Amino acid sequence: HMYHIDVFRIPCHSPGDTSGLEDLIETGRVAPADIVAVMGKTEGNGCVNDYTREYATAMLAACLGRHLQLPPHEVEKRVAFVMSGGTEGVLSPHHTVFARRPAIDAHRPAGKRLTLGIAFTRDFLPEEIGRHAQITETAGAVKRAMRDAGIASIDDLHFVQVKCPLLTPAKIASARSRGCAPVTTDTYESMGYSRGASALGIALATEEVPSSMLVDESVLNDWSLSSSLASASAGIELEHNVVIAIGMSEQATSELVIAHGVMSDAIDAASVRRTIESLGIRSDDEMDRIVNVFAKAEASPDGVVRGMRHTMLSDSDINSTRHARAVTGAAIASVVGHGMVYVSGGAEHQGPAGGGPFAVIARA
Amino acid sequence: HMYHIDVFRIPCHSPGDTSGLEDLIETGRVAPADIVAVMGKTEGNGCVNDYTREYATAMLAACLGRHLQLPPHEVEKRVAFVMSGGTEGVLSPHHTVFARRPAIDAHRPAGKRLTLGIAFTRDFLPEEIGRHAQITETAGAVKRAMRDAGIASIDDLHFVQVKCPLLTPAKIASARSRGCAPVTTDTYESMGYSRGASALGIALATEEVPSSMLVDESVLNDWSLSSSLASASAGIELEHNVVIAIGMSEQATSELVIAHGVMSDAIDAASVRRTIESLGIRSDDEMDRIVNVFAKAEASPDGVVRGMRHTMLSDSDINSTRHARAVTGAAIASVVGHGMVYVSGGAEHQGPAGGGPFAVIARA
Amino acid sequence: HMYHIDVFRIPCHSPGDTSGLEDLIETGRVAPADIVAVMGKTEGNGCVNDYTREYATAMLAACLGRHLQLPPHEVEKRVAFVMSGGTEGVLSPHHTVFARRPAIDAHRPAGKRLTLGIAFTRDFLPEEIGRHAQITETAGAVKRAMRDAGIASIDDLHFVQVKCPLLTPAKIASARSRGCAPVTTDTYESMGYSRGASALGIALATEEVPSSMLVDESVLNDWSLSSSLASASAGIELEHNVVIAIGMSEQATSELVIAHGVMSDAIDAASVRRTIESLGIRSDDEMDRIVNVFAKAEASPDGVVRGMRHTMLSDSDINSTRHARAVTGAAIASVVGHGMVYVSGGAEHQGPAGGGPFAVIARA
Amino acid sequence: HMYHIDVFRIPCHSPGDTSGLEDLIETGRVAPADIVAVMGKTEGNGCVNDYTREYATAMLAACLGRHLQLPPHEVEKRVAFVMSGGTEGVLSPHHTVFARRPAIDAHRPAGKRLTLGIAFTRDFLPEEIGRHAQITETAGAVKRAMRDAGIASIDDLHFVQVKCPLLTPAKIASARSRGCAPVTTDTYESMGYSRGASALGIALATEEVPSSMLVDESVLNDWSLSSSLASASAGIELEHNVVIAIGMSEQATSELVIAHGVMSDAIDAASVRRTIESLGIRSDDEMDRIVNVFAKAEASPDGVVRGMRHTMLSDSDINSTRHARAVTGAAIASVVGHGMVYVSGGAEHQGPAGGGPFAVIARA
Ligand SMILES: [Mg+2]
Ligand SMILES: [Mg+2]
Ligand SMILES: [Mg+2]
Ligand SMILES: [Mg+2]
């Protein structure tokens, strides 16, 4: 488990656009067989009926499938695809492509460097979403991803991305047909339950929350339970959980590092600046050292931001995660200089209530 | 309890428009002091952040307050205001004004005529919404309204309209502060719980459902529990339930009658036609005998309509009640010839699952 | 130009679902090489940022590309793909697959039978959308499609479907870079201009409107100019026009016929019934003879439906075409018994203002 | 023209909430008769069908009408009501109340202080919206407001707020009935034309743009024409323009000052910080000296922000002004510490294209 990790941020002109990926392959900057993960922001609504996520995955998988002579559905078992919908405000649609090669023999860099690992859970029954089985299967996968990454301790883990399912009327009906009530009958609400249970699974694996407290009733109820490393995104496009663990290793030769922090609320640009500063990026001209920023955002569940009422949870036209992405995307863009950053909404049990974890990948 | 009921359908050019009501008063067609209820369709989204409902009520109450020399808030205790938001598709914003006078001392033939009565519940605590207290307080109010209407038996009851509250983040927080979790933390979902509990309250009062089955867990879970007379509408503009009971009486002298039926699903125009036909209205040129139609509509919770998948419960841009109003508004309009009809979304425990009750008021 | 046409309506569980098409191929009901057109309803918003249309096309093209050993982009030059987004209310997502074979030698059926032909225009410059070039290139394509169909006269033409482009900010900027103002700077409005110019192109080819009147200024301004056969759908997924001409021929051996009519407004179910009746379908049990219904719907541009104000053109949350599809989908569903029908919004110069053309394909 | 201006920022729990205003009156902090303007942020969609703006005005006017013994409609001729809808992201609904008294007869130091003046135009015909008449009538009103404010020169003018009308289907039909086509047939687009023409009117009055260039065709086409002081907001609730001119005067005794600047784009928090700094506010604990911030925001019409594509003008679910308010609200909140600030969307001819003017009122 000694690797060289490459990370590329590539613009997308639309959800099905693979021209940027093709360019990386054609110019020899990446080998198709080395790609281990793709984290995307796609311009659908990021909620239940967002098929831009599935479409992006389909086109990426087809693209790599051609180069590898594999069917797309096989590529999806090989590569961790995490498509986060919703690019509101200044958020600019893009992919972050992660490639993994054996570590360079020429030993060795001056400190720890970027490493990455992936894992998958089994498919979940509808009645398991938002509940114990999702928590525990996720925890297992997180540990597997950490091992796959060669991450020696929790101190060297900086970001855990999870893609998770949601409920549809068909799945709700299937659940009821077996005499099992699902966690909710509202499809939008189901996304929060899925994200939350997945995030608690991360907290379990990382020992940030003791196992004793992770009863079904705690999901979306107990705000004090969280992982400071967790980034969960729900979608209609899958029935299982996909896990990407990102961290640092002595054995890695990557020309990249990662640092993480937590935004105390949706407008906490100060925390983002502090983390960027910690990576030695201390002027606006040094911002180009950042490969990407990955952040969680949410509508504060108490209905207020720094003492002032917000409307994000009472707005029946625009769902709360859409508002939250718009806000945090803008806050982060005001720091780094543009909106081509990964911002994902719904931060249930991810960082503080009303806040969320974030990570920054930068040139070493 | 011997009345003459007048019913007027008046167009609104916007939510605050009282010009039509003023015209009825100025031309002597109605006396302000005789008005007992107003049922409106207002052109907000009909969901959580729809303030067109409150605005319409405020302007109507101010209008009548001037004529009666009362403060608006006093008028609201005197008159049952039920503002149902959401006028999608061909739905045309309007008010239906109900006026009550002592029965007229003159000959009328054999045959029952339109009667109406109103009632109010106490304010509900946030934690009571969607639960036992809402069910039982509603049941009490329904019986009071029936008595107020002079409705002798359940057979002579044709429509029970209820306006009910919903949850906001502030109310959810208040509930939690007393150690009582609310029925849901999703503000949109709370509207369904409120409507559903209120409708079961109606079912209790009318003996359509036995009291034994009305446990909290049955709300939104047990589809087989319903009232065939119930029409419930949730709103941000009130903390209590408002009840209007509409029916028929031998002692009433109204030049109007009412009949009711049930739509088996959102496109069951056939049932609406059958009820209209039962009132002696057969041809298209006899449709002008209808004063108004009042109908409940909903997205079929099994996710299908007559065997075909629908998207109304998986659409994160347009909420299910907006879709349902559009559909049933169109179905009804295709029969009666226009969209100036009362169609209200979310028919939890109101008629069949996926369907809803409706009533027709017509010239005698 | 003597054909046998097969038409299949197949449900979709999501935009990328090709399982139904595969089933038709696997059971020998259709040969991949015989498929000439697919008309789909996909569950995106049907407006500017609907990528469900492109996704559906991509997956269908990939599916057929495998069977034909062709790249998907080649399949799109061979098969006319028309994906109409927006499945509001009871509208059920589906594809209608059209296959064409040489006429059966066993001559010959008792009257004219279903025939079909296709054509494509060149790509349009952004500044050509909504204008003369789009009108005239469309007219050319319509005549080519009619010839391809073996349609002898205009009397035997029953439906002309066109898929057309729209404007994005990038296209608007490109136009301005050449010193040419586009027809509009509003991306949503551009869809109506594209549909309208395309529809007038149809009217030109069919001689329903004289060429003298088709100046640029008439597009979206002169309501009296229209085609009673035209069905136009705009989308982000293409830069050219795709044309499908559907009609009747003596030379065709298809076990199918087509009839067309016009809805005078969005709730004119009566006209739909009349056309269905003309095909010998005269009871509810005979409705299963209908393969599909294809209809245009729109928000009445005068702001009223049968004398009553509507809100479809003043609603900033839900665009007018979404409302219109919900309404007409419901009206038609109330007749045929379900919502798995092709209903497309925005009927500029298509039938009467506020109305639209429709066609019914039924078993002979 | 020698005044003392008081400015109060008061939270609103809903659009009709006047409890905060009542509190200011009851505690003697403001006299009802001294109120000259109210600028509000209301939680409707801020677009065409937002009646929260009218509702807020109605309730404020009714509140003050009671204290002044005037009918509400008379209060609206006395007080400049500017209600800007749309409070997306962290934007917190509130009113800013402006009161004017004769200059206080006491010592104050050297240095200009806050002054304010108001004006109204005549009602506009639908066909005048977005055109010459709106431009020139606005210019007249701006000069009148400046005079009313006692603003000696353009150098002492810091903010010009204008409320302006929009088009509805009824108004479009009325225009066409007189043979005058309106500037657009899209109701949403009409808001931009109204704002733009109004802003150019401000530019005319302030000599930032020469009269020669202000032809009808320049509206929304020529991005190089703008006012750096203009803040225009369109609404359904009025048919005329309302003007508030805010500036500085030697003759004013207000315990307040104002400064203005321009955001180069929607995420230009740096410019906001610079202006705040110029008022002697440097640290986070000095931010409480700011009474309010008033800012214009818009979706960059070239479709990019700092070189990266944005989706705000291609999003058919969420209109561009909603996105823009969310973004700039967040950017500003990240500086001042909360979202209870006036942010208004659609900055056509207001500051740079993609940017907008802003002003800050702070304690002297
Ligand atoms: Mg959180
Ligand atoms: Mg029901
Ligand atoms: Mg038409
Ligand atoms: Mg600007």
Numbering used by the authors:
A (entry chain B), B (entry chain A), C (entry chain B), D (entry chain A): 0 to 363
What do the authors of the reporting publication say about this deposited model?
This cavity contains three lysine/serine dyads (Lys42, Ser85, Lys162, Ser233, Lys296 and Ser344) any, or all, of which could plausibly form the catalytic site. AtzD possesses a single metal binding site per monomer, in RU C, for which there is no equivalent in the YgjF family of proteins, but which is completely conserved in 90% of the AtzD homologues currently available (data not shown). The metal appears to stabilize an extended loop that contains residues that make polar contact with amino acids in the adjacent RU, which may stabilize the β-strand that holds Lys296 in the active site and contribute to the stability of the enzyme more generally. In addition, this highly ordered structure orients Glu348 in an interaction with Arg195, which sits in the active site.
AtzD catalyses the hydrolytic ring opening of CA to yield 1-carboxybiuret which then spontaneously decomposes to biuret and carbon dioxide. Herein, we describe the first X-ray structure for this family, an unusual concatenated knot fold (which we term the ‘Toblerone’ fold), that possesses a threefold rotational symmetry that extends to the active-site architecture. The AtzD monomer is a unique arrangement of a core of 12 β-strands with six helices on the outside. This structure is formed from three ‘repeating units’ (RUs) that share the same structure as one another; they have been designated RU A (residues 3–104), B (residues 113–250) and C (residues 256–364). Structural, mutagenesis and biochemical studies suggest that AtzD, and the other members of the Toblerone fold family (TrzD and Bar), are lysine-serine hydrolases.
